[PDB]
């Protein structure tokens, strides 16, 4: 199963534009 | 969505239109959650104040779309839907609290490029992530502003609010089956759902396994991007035996 | 303001 997984970005370790800003929230 | 910006290609291939098939226009957002089941805010299907009651032939599911008015030939798949569910304890009459639904398509959707499911969580991930100041990230083809419509898909990343900030913005009751985000007057950066938005998913990436999860569903607003109000989001989570009942059920 | 789309869909 591969829910979640985008073709276009984490199937070919690509990041897209703001998910950074998604990860940097998640701090603790 | 207000003060959101243009998505990438391929950015959220789980996004879904609900479209009205007469007149022609946007109902709503949707998610696909598998090659054959769609999921929604009841809301987008059942509102008696508003005298929106469709059915099944009322309405088309419209996948892997970026331009609002298009025809994407070659890209987007048109689906028609052999049956809406929707929440038996859906309270439209005071709060929409337990505003979800699922559509199953007459058939399977072939997944590409463009089209893909998202992941729902389970209870570990909920608690992971669903806490306060923990962005999501919300998609639509709804309105620019609050009182025009965009020429592609718009997506915003807004941070989850903690709960006495959202019972202390509106005078309708709250309830553990929703959660509020956006960002406070304090905070300088802006950005909400609005007309139109409604059904799409809050999404977030889990830092654990790099997948995207469905945490929400774009349910009910006052106004748009106001400061000092929120958007309210269905806790799939606390639905979700809901949603395993019915497609247990019913799926193939 | 929406394109038509296939007639096999409606
Ligand atoms: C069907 C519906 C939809 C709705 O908002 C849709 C709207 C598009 N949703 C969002 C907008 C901005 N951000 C996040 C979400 C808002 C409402 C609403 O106004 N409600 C209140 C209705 C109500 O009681 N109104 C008065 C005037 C009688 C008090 C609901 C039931 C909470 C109803
Ligand atoms: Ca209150
Ligand atoms: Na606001």
Redo the contacts between chains.
């Keep these: 199963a591969d829910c979640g997984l985008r073709p276009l970005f984490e199937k070919k370790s690509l990041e897209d534009k703001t998910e950074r800003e998604l990860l940097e929230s998640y701090i603790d | 969505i207000v003060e959101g910006?243009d998505a990438?290609?391929?950015?959220s291939?789980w996004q879904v239109m609900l479209?009205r098939?007469s007149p022609?226009?946007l109902l709503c957002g949707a998610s696909l959650?598998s090659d054959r089941w769609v999921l929604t805010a009841a809301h987008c299907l059942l509102y008696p104040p508003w005298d929106k009651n469709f059915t099944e032939n009322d309405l088309?599911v419209r996948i892997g779309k970026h331009s609002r008015?298009?025809?994407e030939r070659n890209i987007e798949k048109?689906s028609?839907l052999e049956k809406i569910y929707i929440h038996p304890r859906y309270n439209w009459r005071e709060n929409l609290d337990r505003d979800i639904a699922l559509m199953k398509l007459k058939k399977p959707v072939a997944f590409?490029?463009?089209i893909?499911?998202?992941?729902?969580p389970d209870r570990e991930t909920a608690a992971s992530?669903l806490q306060a100041?923990?962005?999501?990230?919300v998609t639509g083809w709804g309105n620019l502003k609050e009182t025009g419509?965009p020429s592609v898909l718009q997506?915003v990343?807004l941070?989850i609010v903690e709960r006495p900030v959202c019972k202390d913005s509106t005078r309708i009751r709250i309830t553990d089956n929703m959660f509020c985000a956006g960002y406070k007057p304090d905070e300088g950066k802006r950005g909400d759902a609005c007309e139109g938005d409604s059904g799409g998913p809050f999404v977030?990436?889990?830092?654990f396994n790099?997948?995207?999860?469905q945490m929400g569903i774009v349910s009910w607003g006052e106004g748009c991007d106001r400061d000092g109000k929120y958007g309210f989001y269905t806790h799939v989570f606390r639905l979700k035996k809901w949603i395993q009942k019915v497609i247990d059920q019913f799926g193939e | 303001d929406f394109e038509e789309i296939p007639e096999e869909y409606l």
């Design positions: 910006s990438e290609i391929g950015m291939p479209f098939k022609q226009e959650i088309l008015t298009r025809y048109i028609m590409s490029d463009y893909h499911p998202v992941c729902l992530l100041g923990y962005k999501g990230r419509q997506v990343n941070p977030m990436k889990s830092p790099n997948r995207w999860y």
